[PDB]
Design a binder for this molecule. Structure first.
Ligand SMILES: O=C(O)/C(S)=C/c1c(F)ccc(F)c1F
Ligand SMILES: [Zn+2]
Ligand SMILES: [Zn+2]
Length: 222
């Protein structure tokens, strides 16, 4: 697939189909680069992102790269939980007039932790349409965090698992300070029950996979 990088290599976009790309950014933490993934949706009414990035500098540069390439503005972002990889660029979004969608719980947690607040407009199931691009958001229950949601593209059967879903390279659950490891299995089961025919699964970190990433996450939770 087509892969396009910034000069530093810290931001990359990879094409999944004509209108759907994965964005990946490296956040540097004590000398260790840590990548994280979101989506870029190229719609007839603008660009929509699933997730920002670790901080405002990276978010600014991601927006600028995609607006230049796709020749449209970023209009909306969906924030999938209130950790820095997802929400760290919220100040940039607000000051540019980019709408930052989230559940109410994600917005409360953002505020509790000193971030600017997203809209708190998403429910347990929300169906959005941007141009011709359909987007469903789903709260499956607690897992990696109490608030994590997934994003589904029904025209492509693409699931953005976010940090609820571990990549094949993840050999443990990672940081579980804010996680609910009992509920996590049930939450993944709720995803597997809702979306029974999945073409790709985008984890929060690591390589794109398929429903096997869900099953891998269930095994890590044993
Ligand atoms: O494993 C992950 O998906 C994530 S988001 C871990 C994590 C976290 F628990 C707290 C803060 C943060 F900045 C993080 F990156
Ligand atoms: Zn997280
Ligand atoms: Zn994460």
């Amino acid at each position: 697939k087509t892969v396009i990088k910034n000069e530093t290599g810290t931001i990359s976009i990879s094409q999944l189909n004509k209108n759907v790309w994965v964005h990946t950014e490296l956040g540097s933490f004590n000398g260790e680069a840590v990548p994280s993934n979101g989506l870029v949706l190229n719609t007839s009414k603008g660009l929509v992102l699933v997730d920002s990035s670790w901080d405002d500098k990276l978010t600014k540069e991601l927006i600028e790269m995609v607006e230049k390439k796709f020749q449209k503005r970023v209009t909306d972002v969906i924030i999938t939980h209130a950790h820095a990889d997802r929400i760290g660029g919220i100040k940039t979004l607000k000051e540019r007039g980019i709408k930052a969608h989230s559940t109410a719980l994600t917005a409360e947690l953002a505020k509790k932790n000193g971030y600017e607040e997203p809209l708190g407009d998403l429910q347990t199931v929300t169906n959005l349409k941007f141009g011709n691009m359909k987007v469903e958001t789903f709260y499956p229950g607690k897992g990696h965090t109490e608030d994590n949601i997934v994003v589904w593209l029904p025209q492509y059967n693409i699931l953005v698992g976010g940090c609820l879903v571990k990549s094949t390279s993840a050999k443990d659950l990672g940081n579980v300070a804010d996680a609910y490891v009992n509920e996590w299995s049930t939450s993944i089961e709720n995803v597997l029950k809702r979306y029974r025919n999945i073409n790709a699964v985008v984890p929060g970190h690591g390589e794109v996979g398929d429903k096997g990433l869900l099953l891998h996450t269930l095994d890590l939770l044993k």
